[PDB]
Amino acid sequence: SVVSIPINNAGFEDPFIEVVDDYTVDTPPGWTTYNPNNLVPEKRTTWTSNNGVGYVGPGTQFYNQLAPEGRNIGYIYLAQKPGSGVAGFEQILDATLEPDTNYTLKVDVGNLAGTFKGLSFAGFPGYRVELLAGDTVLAADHNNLFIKEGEFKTSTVTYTSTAKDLHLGQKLGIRLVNLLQDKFSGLDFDNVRLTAEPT
Amino acid sequence: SVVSIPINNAGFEDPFIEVVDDYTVDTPPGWTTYNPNNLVPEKRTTWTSNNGVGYVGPGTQFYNQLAPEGRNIGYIYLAQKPGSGVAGFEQILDATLEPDTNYTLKVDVGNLAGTFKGLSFAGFPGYRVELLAGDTVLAADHNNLFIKEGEFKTSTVTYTSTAKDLHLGQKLGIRLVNLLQDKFSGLDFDNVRLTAEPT
Amino acid sequence: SVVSIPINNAGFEDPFIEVVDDYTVDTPPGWTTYNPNNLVPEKRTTWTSNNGVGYVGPGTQFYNQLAPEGRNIGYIYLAQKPGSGVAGFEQILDATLEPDTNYTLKVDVGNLAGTFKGLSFAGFPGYRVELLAGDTVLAADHNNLFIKEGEFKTSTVTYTSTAKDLHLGQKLGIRLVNLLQDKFSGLDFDNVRLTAEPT
Amino acid sequence: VVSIPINNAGFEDPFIEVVDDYTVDTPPGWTTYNPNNLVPEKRTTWTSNNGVGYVGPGTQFYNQLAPEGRNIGYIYLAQKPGSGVAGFEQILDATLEPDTNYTLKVDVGNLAGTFKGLSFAGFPGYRVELLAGDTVLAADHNNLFIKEGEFKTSTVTYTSTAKDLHLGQKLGIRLVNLLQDKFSGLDFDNVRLTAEPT
Ligand SMILES: CN1CCC/C1=C1/C=Nc2ccccc21
Ligand SMILES: CN1CCC/C1=C1/C=Nc2ccccc21
Ligand SMILES: CN1CCC/C1=C1/C=Nc2ccccc21
Ligand SMILES: CN1CCC/C1=C1/C=Nc2ccccc21
Ligand SMILES: CN1CCC/C1=C1/C=Nc2ccccc21
Ligand SMILES: CN1CCC/C1=C1/C=Nc2ccccc21
Ligand SMILES: [Ca+2]
Ligand SMILES: [Ca+2]
Ligand SMILES: [Ca+2]
Ligand SMILES: [Ca+2]
Ligand SMILES: [Ca+2]
Ligand SMILES: [Ca+2]
Ligand SMILES: [Ca+2]
Ligand SMILES: [Ca+2]
Ligand SMILES: [Mg+2]
């Protein structure tokens, strides 16, 4: 009855990282950088806004737990001051909106904890998880969960299509967004799952 | 330890409406028209985009139930084509954002049903319910409930403040939004409730 | 020697209306609702039989002309099925029927045109314009003029009193009647004029 | 311009031999329009009545001969003004057609003089109606001023449209005495109904 919709690099496991708490600063394969406010430069450093993957592995300093799934999470970090805009990840899927279907989008959202190289990761920028059809946002979870420092929680976004939806046949999309509402303005995501069930 | 946050005209019971299925075309008292795309004119007619209150009482042609609370609901109707923008209701409260507090916003959202002499009320434009602090959207439910033709369902939006939140001491706010993602592009709200509970 | 008999609100200009195609749903001031079949309720809505005044200004969707006189017209719309009865406007004048006098009553009658979101204004219910003395209809034009969609035409009713008329000294009166013989079952009136002239 | 057929349109049936003589029974081809039961089944000279009258050479009642042929059709109502209305009705075989301008004409007579001590001064008012089914499409309710001893031609106009509700219903004619005043007799003659494209 309930069907899994394929998503590329849904657990950010690509690329493989060898040393715990190491990370990349380039867009994860299979994802695009959602950049409506042009906060993330094409060429990144550890100083600029950036995104990529990080290995949340045995004895990680940043969390009270391992990655929700496999080795890695996907992160978005924004250097600009709170209120300067939003950015994150986007992926347009091969699947299209079908009529009389219940879509359930689940993503794990992480609030980084601790102190590293004299930098405090206390605080949280807010998140939004969006399900798209074309570039319409069908349904979204704008920051409803409370996520304690050093944990992940599962966001759930749901849409139900009717027989005559205007967006039928448009490609489904997912956006994972750093709201940059506060500092520390890094946000982690993991284990994106999307299911469809005929109504 | 749960506390009610007072909201003016929270069930749109002002003004009194005498005749079932009658309605106003002016901003309900205590509310303002959220109008970021200027879709709703200053001077409204029965022919234009409009908002107001509407009596969903015994014998309603619009619903398979009465108003969620009292006699009336607040409606926002947009005449423009899907994707023209959004509009709805906004109210800024006296209450301010306090630390270590779980805020819970609930609102009933209505999908109007039926026909009238060639007019069709089938379909639904999408909703979003927002909790604000100042100009910031702290949390929002963007269209996650599926709502059948001729029913209301309760949307719940939640935010939890920490001790160090950047928006502490700013005025809480509520926005009820017609997404205009499809037609028929009327949307109803009722029974707005906001509670605050120390963590 | 042609004298014009004063009629209150003869051109439906009270009340003043700001917005083109806006309208009241209350009997126009100076008039009463002629309601022999009780088709028009005391409290009217968008969904009921109604009457009132309507602003036909530059840009109106209803007519290929402006109002015959000033800004406004007086309208009567009947929701009930054709054959259900008649309704409209009546005004009893201060003037009385005098002997050996030619009476000329003129009124412009409007047939609405067009379409609104599935609603059609195509068709016309028939009109009757009546000159009264007391409760007696002295003369009436029952639907003799062909009125094209989106235009007004002038109806003229004539009565010549003799020295021995049964009704001498009775109060003159005017009735503007929606016949409800077909649909669309709204029609409009404007610019009511009554003159008296010694024979 | 098409002539729509009407039976006994001139009230020429029945033939009357003596000038100013008359019948007191419903003219052939017509029915008595009687919504208020003012006219009895059995009529005398004292009751409300209807019939035909020979307005021939030297007629006492008019300044002219019948508008058409020998006879007119009359309606007289004995009841007091305001008691109601009565007259003649005929349903035709022709039915309402769209995009058509219908013109109904009838001459309407205001009887004059004194006869056996009765004054015919005054006039009850008239209404000429065009019908489709039992709907009055159009009517002249007493718009003409008719002088004592004259006939004047009443004209009733209706224009049909493409989606008229009454398309295909039988056309009909009513000639009505309004009983608004006395003397409360009313005469008609020369009923003509034409049709032409819009
Ligand atoms: C030098 N900068 C800019 C601010 C944060 C950052 C990091 C460098 N390594 C990191 C590892 C984990 C989280 C943040 C950083
Ligand atoms: C916020 N930033 C900036 C650079 C890397 C980083 C991480 C966020 N979560 C992480 C988990 C594991 C390793 C690194 C990061
Ligand atoms: C969508 N619109 C436009 C005008 C009023 C209307 C209503 C919506 N809900 C209602 C409930 C009761 C009465 C009217 C309305
Ligand atoms: C048929 N109806 C019912 C409600 C209003 C209306 C109008 C008719 N002519 C009008 C001219 C101007 C404004 C409104 C109307
Ligand atoms: C005896 N009565 C009472 C009512 C009218 C009448 C007439 C008798 N012959 C008539 C000839 C012409 C007109 C009227 C009458
Ligand atoms: C008003 N009444 C009642 C009985 C006869 C009648 C006539 C009316 N016109 C007439 C013309 C010629 C002859 C008789 C009548
Ligand atoms: Ca992972
Ligand atoms: Ca943190
Ligand atoms: Ca309410
Ligand atoms: Ca609906
Ligand atoms: Ca006017
Ligand atoms: Ca029309
Ligand atoms: Ca004849
Ligand atoms: Ca006479
Ligand atoms: Mg309150």
GROMACS .gro file of C-alpha atoms in nm, chain A residues 24 30 49 55 60 76 89 111 132 170-171 177 182 189 192 197:
model
   16
   24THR     CA    1   3.309   1.873   0.379
   30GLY     CA    2   2.253   1.461  -0.539
   49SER     CA    3   2.836   3.040   0.488
   55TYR     CA    4   3.061   1.239   1.018
   60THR     CA    5   3.139   1.277   1.840
   76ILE     CA    6   2.394   2.425   0.655
   89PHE     CA    7   1.931   2.205   0.050
  111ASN     CA    8   2.071   2.113   1.708
  132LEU     CA    9   0.722   2.087  -0.336
  170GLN     CA   10   0.460   1.829  -1.159
  171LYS     CA   11   0.781   1.692  -1.010
  177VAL     CA   12   1.592   2.518   0.515
  182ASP     CA   13   1.910   3.308   1.578
  189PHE     CA   14   1.960   1.727   0.871
  192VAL     CA   15   1.511   1.216   0.449
  197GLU     CA   16  -0.007   0.599  -0.013
   0.00000   0.00000   0.00000
